Design an enzyme around this catalytic site. Structure first.
Site, PDB file in Angstrom:
ATOM      1  N   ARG A 130       0.817  -1.207   0.000  1.00  0.00           N
ATOM      2  CA  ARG A 130       0.000   0.000   0.000  1.00  0.00           C
ATOM      3  C   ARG A 130       0.849   1.253   0.000  1.00  0.00           C
ATOM      4  NH1 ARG A 130      -4.968   2.341   2.021  1.00  0.00           N
ATOM      5  NH2 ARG A 130      -4.709   3.724   3.834  1.00  0.00           N
ATOM      6  N   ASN A 176     -10.195   2.721   9.730  1.00  0.00           N
ATOM      7  CA  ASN A 176     -10.648   2.581   8.335  1.00  0.00           C
ATOM      8  C   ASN A 176     -10.508   1.138   7.851  1.00  0.00           C
ATOM      9  OD1 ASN A 176      -7.904   3.741   8.868  1.00  0.00           O
ATOM     10  ND2 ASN A 176      -7.509   2.860   6.828  1.00  0.00           N
ATOM     11  N   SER A 184      -7.512  -0.629   2.243  1.00  0.00           N
ATOM     12  CA  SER A 184      -7.321  -0.976   0.834  1.00  0.00           C
ATOM     13  C   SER A 184      -5.834  -1.191   0.558  1.00  0.00           C
ATOM     14  CB  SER A 184      -7.821   0.154  -0.067  1.00  0.00           C
ATOM     15  OG  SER A 184      -9.217   0.264   0.018  1.00  0.00           O
ATOM     16  N   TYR A 228      -1.527   5.001  -7.355  1.00  0.00           N
ATOM     17  CA  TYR A 228      -0.783   4.815  -6.108  1.00  0.00           C
ATOM     18  C   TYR A 228       0.546   4.182  -6.426  1.00  0.00           C
ATOM     19  CZ  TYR A 228      -5.726   4.899  -5.066  1.00  0.00           C
ATOM     20  OH  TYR A 228      -7.067   5.223  -5.037  1.00  0.00           O
ATOM     21  N   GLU A 267      -6.809  -4.996  -5.928  1.00  0.00           N
ATOM     22  CA  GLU A 267      -7.066  -4.684  -4.524  1.00  0.00           C
ATOM     23  C   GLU A 267      -7.395  -5.879  -3.627  1.00  0.00           C
ATOM     24  OE1 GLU A 267      -9.727  -1.832  -1.597  1.00  0.00           O
ATOM     25  OE2 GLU A 267      -9.443  -1.236  -3.726  1.00  0.00           O
TER      26      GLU A 267
HETATM   27  O1  LIG Z   1      -7.048   7.845  -1.003  1.00  0.00           O
HETATM   28  C1  LIG Z   1      -7.266   6.761  -1.503  1.00  0.00           C
HETATM   29  C2  LIG Z   1      -8.427   6.575  -2.445  1.00  0.00           C
HETATM   30  C3  LIG Z   1      -9.129   7.857  -2.892  1.00  0.00           C
HETATM   31  N1  LIG Z   1     -10.060   7.729  -3.984  1.00  0.00           N
HETATM   32  C4  LIG Z   1     -11.182   6.583  -4.252  1.00  0.00           C
HETATM   33  C5  LIG Z   1     -11.324   6.508  -5.079  1.00  0.00           C
HETATM   34  C6  LIG Z   1     -11.837   7.924  -5.722  1.00  0.00           C
HETATM   35  C7  LIG Z   1     -11.077   9.206  -5.059  1.00  0.00           C
HETATM   36  C8  LIG Z   1     -10.258   9.052  -4.920  1.00  0.00           C
HETATM   37  N2  LIG Z   1      -6.403   5.673  -1.143  1.00  0.00           N
HETATM   38  C9  LIG Z   1      -5.308   5.910  -0.255  1.00  0.00           C
HETATM   39  C10 LIG Z   1      -4.025   5.414  -0.785  1.00  0.00           C
HETATM   40  C11 LIG Z   1      -4.075   4.094  -1.464  1.00  0.00           C
HETATM   41  N3  LIG Z   1      -2.919   3.384  -1.639  1.00  0.00           N
HETATM   42  C12 LIG Z   1      -2.915   2.161  -2.258  1.00  0.00           C
HETATM   43  O2  LIG Z   1      -1.724   1.532  -2.400  1.00  0.00           O
HETATM   44  C13 LIG Z   1      -4.169   1.549  -2.719  1.00  0.00           C
HETATM   45  C14 LIG Z   1      -4.187   0.295  -3.345  1.00  0.00           C
HETATM   46  C15 LIG Z   1      -5.427  -0.228  -3.772  1.00  0.00           C
HETATM   47  F1  LIG Z   1      -5.445  -1.401  -4.366  1.00  0.00           F
HETATM   48  C16 LIG Z   1      -6.633   0.482  -3.610  1.00  0.00           C
HETATM   49  C17 LIG Z   1      -6.614   1.714  -2.993  1.00  0.00           C
HETATM   50  C18 LIG Z   1      -5.356   2.245  -2.541  1.00  0.00           C
HETATM   51  C19 LIG Z   1      -5.296   3.565  -1.891  1.00  0.00           C
HETATM   52  C20 LIG Z   1      -6.571   4.353  -1.688  1.00  0.00           C
HETATM   53 CL   LIG Z   2      -7.345   6.143   4.131  1.00  0.00          CL
END
Ligand SMILES: O=C(CCN1CCCCC1)N1CCc2[nH]c(=O)c3cc(F)ccc3c2C1
Ligand SMILES: [Cl-]
Ligand SMILES: [Cl-]
Ligand code: NA
Length: 445
Positions: free
Chosen positions: A323, A366, A369, A380, A413
């Site tokens: 992550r 939380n 993810s 990311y 994910e």
């Molecule tokens: O802030 C968000 C999401 C914000 N988001 C939703 C969607 C629409 C607006 C914008 N994060 C924190 C950092 C992070 N880092 C990962 O490595 C990752 C890996 C995955 F497989 C899935 C999620 C993540 C996320 C998800």
């Molecule tokens: Cl978060």
């Protein structure tokens, strides 16, 4: 027929070498069609691509008979032929060699900077004809193994170190792969030995013990934890197969919110959950206006549904997930901590994060993810986030592979349930083009 002879050609190679390639999802395909018609080489780019043979000759990919496709799903495509011809066999072993040194962990991370490789390369580069003072340079090893460009950038007698390897990576991968090819093709082996003895002995050690040693060490690690690294082929297969049953046991509402959560529901849900950092502080007196109340009830219902979905799923073996995060990981006051400047990770900051957080436990209120593989997606990645969390998930944790329900399947994910206790285990600076801080966490159940 020719397909069988092609198979027999590969099966002459050490089982250990084929094992390492398989471990990273490496697949070997034998085809009667042109390489560029194969499923694996479909991308419009492969159309106008060229390859270079072991002897430095350029051909259109479409015209050639073997190709190691690198990247996150490595494949070796081989045109089926007689392969009685040693001129042909040596090219197959050459591309296989490349597949090993370029595409397969752990060799593609450490090997070319290894004293053993560097020592062997320096000795070949320093071979002499005479034995006394002012002996003529012997170019026989360089002529046999070094590519054109490498011979231009490196002179005989000149010294090879880690920075020369790093600046000429593909050229040294060629040296490795060609040594490998000549060592394994029986009618090239004696020439390798005669003309570049130092690189012969290097490959002899790999063949006679050290490939095996690297392979057993991988087997040992795989017994303790499942770690897909950046490779996607085995990861996607494991994710889909392992959670297929769980997916059939979801309600419509549960599937909808899993999807929504990877989209616009993400922030409102996780913000609500993080509200008081786990302290129970009831809001009492007055009331929310009708729209805010409706919005809150909706969020509470989404959380009920997500909780219910993830409770039905249990991870059945020790797993590594990944992550990306920013310095806000360590608290709101770290927002502008400036951990990385100009792509450089500040060493003294890492030392104080380590001093402050190493060994410390905390609760992620939380949902968590994560990706089943390292850095699969532009959202990311290393470019935007200076911290990679490498997370060890013990068997028994509630989490599930949700990529096929996600608005972003390319993120692979793994969704881990809310409210687990995590521990900061280790802090490591990872160098390339940006450096990053790898932070190992473990879930504490
Ligand atoms: O802030 C968000 C999401 C914000 N988001 C939703 C969607 C629409 C607006 C914008 N994060 C924190 C950092 C992070 N880092 C990962 O490595 C990752 C890996 C995955 F497989 C899935 C999620 C993540 C996320 C998800
Ligand atoms: Cl978060
Ligand atoms: Cl973040
Ligand atoms: Na439980």
């Amino acid at each position: 027929e020719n397909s069988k002879k092609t198979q027999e050609l590969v099966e002459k190679l050490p089982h250990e070498v084929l094992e390492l390639y398989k471990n990273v999802g490496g697949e070997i395909y034998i085809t009667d069609k042109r390489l560029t018609q194969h499923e694996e080489l479909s991308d419009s780019s492969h159309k106008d691509m060229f390859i270079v043979s072991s002897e430095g000759k350029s051909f259109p990919l479409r015209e050639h008979f073997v190709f190691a496709k690198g990247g996150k799903e490595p494949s070796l495509i081989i045109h089926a032929e007689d392969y009685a011809s040693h001129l042909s066999s040596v090219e197959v072993y050459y591309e296989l060699g490349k597949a090993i040194i370029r595409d397969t962990f752990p060799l593609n991370q450490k090997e070319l900077g290894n004293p053993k490789f560097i020592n062997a390369i320096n000795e070949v580069n320093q071979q002499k004809e005479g034995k006394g003072v002012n002996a003529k340079a012997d170019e026989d090893g360089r002529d046999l193994l070094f590519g054109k460009e490498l011979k231009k950038n490196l002179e005989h007698g000149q010294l090879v170190d880690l920075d020369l390897i790093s600046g000429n990576l593909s050229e040294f991968q060629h040296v490795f792969a060609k040594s490998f090819a000549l060592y394994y093709e029986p009618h090239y082996k004696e020439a390798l030995k005669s003309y570049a003895p130092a690189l012969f002995n290097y490959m002899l050690e790999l063949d006679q013990m050290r490939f095996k040693e690297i392979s057993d060490d991988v087997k040992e690690k795989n017994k303790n934890v499942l770690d897909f690294k950046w490779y996607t082929r085995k990861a996607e297969s494991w994710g889909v197969q392992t959670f297929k049953n769980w997916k059939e046991n979801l309600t419509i509402s549960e599937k909808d919110i899993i999807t929504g959560y990877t989209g616009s529901k993400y922030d409102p849900i996780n913000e609500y959950l993080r509200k008081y950092d786990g302290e129970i502080i009831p809001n009492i007196g007055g009331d929310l206006d009708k729209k805010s109340k409706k919005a809150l009830e909706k969020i509470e219902n989404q959380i009920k549904n997500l909780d219910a979905a993830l409770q039905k799923s249990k991870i059945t073996e020790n797993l590594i997930v990944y992550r990306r995060v920013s310095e806000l990981q360590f608290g709101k006051k770290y927002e502008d901590y400036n951990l990385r400047q100009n792509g450089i990770i500040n060493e003294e900051k890492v030392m104080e994060l380590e001093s402050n957080f190493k060994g410390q436990t905390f609760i992620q209120h939380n949902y968590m993810s994560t990706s089943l593989v390292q850095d699969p997606h532009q959202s990311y990645s290393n470019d935007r986030y200076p911290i990679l969390l490498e997370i060890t998930i013990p068997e028994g944790v509630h989490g599930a592979y949700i990529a096929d329900m996600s608005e972003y399947p390319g993120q692979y994910e793994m969704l881990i349930n809310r409210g687990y206790t995590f521990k900061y285990d280790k802090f490591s600076i990872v160098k390339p083009g940006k450096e990053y801080l790898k932070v190992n966490l473990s879930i504490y159940l």
